[PDB]
């Protein structure tokens, strides 16, 4: 199977990349994820809010109330500076990792000679 922790990591990554594209609210995020996935990934609100409560508590995203021109309150989320930085540190750390793995295949092969 795919371990829960890995799923969670995936969902995190995706959701942060939606915010990267712009401040958004629950139903916008879900729709965007559904379209970009062909409906193969349909987030719940429960899930999205459980994740965001965690990201917000750790200061990676922040929330704010939208215009009430609509006449009803809507909560928006954005990536924070720390947010942006972690996404950057993460991305780079992973590309080093992918290099290390190239090098393992390389070194293996090279000693087949």
Site of interaction with a copy of itself (CB under 8 A): 1-3, 5-7, 9-10, 13-14, 17-18, 21-22, 32-33, 35-37, 40-41, 86, 89-90, 93-94, 96-97, 100-101, 103-108
Smallest gap from Cβ 37 to a copy of itself, in A, equals 5
Residue number with CB closer to a copy of itself (28 or 74): 28
State CA 98 to chain mean position distance: 19
Least gap, CB of 46 to a copy of itself (angstroms): 20
Distance CA 49, CA 70 (A): 22
Nearer to a copy of itself, 37 or 44 (CB): 37
Helix (H, G, I), strand (E, B) or coil at 77: strand
Residue 76's closest CA among 26, 113, 9?
Answer: 26
Q: Checking phi first, is residue 62 left (phi over 0); if not, alpha (psi -120 to 50) or beta?
A: beta
Q: Mind spelling out the 3-state secondary structure of 89-103?
A: HHHHHHHHHHHHHHH
* CB nearer a copy of itself, residue 21 or residue 72: 21
Nearer to a copy of itself, 18 or 72 (CB): 18
Least separation in angstroms between CB 71 and a copy of itself? 25
């Amino acid at each position: 199977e795919i371990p829960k922790e890995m799923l969670r990591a995936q969902t995190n990554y995706i959701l942060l990349n939606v915010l990267k594209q712009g401040d958004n609210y629950v139903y916008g995020i879900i729709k965007q994820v559904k379209e970009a996935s062909n409906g193969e990934m349909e987030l719940n609100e429960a899930t999205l809010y459980t994740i965001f409560d965690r990201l917000e508590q750790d200061g990676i995203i922040s929330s704010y109330w939208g215009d009430e021109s609509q006449g009803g309150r809507r909560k928006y989320y954005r990536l924070t500076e720390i947010g942006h930085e972690n996404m950057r540190l993460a991305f780079e750390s992973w590309s080093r990792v992918d290099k290390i793995i190239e090098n393992l295949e390389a070194n293996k092969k090279s000693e087949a000679i």
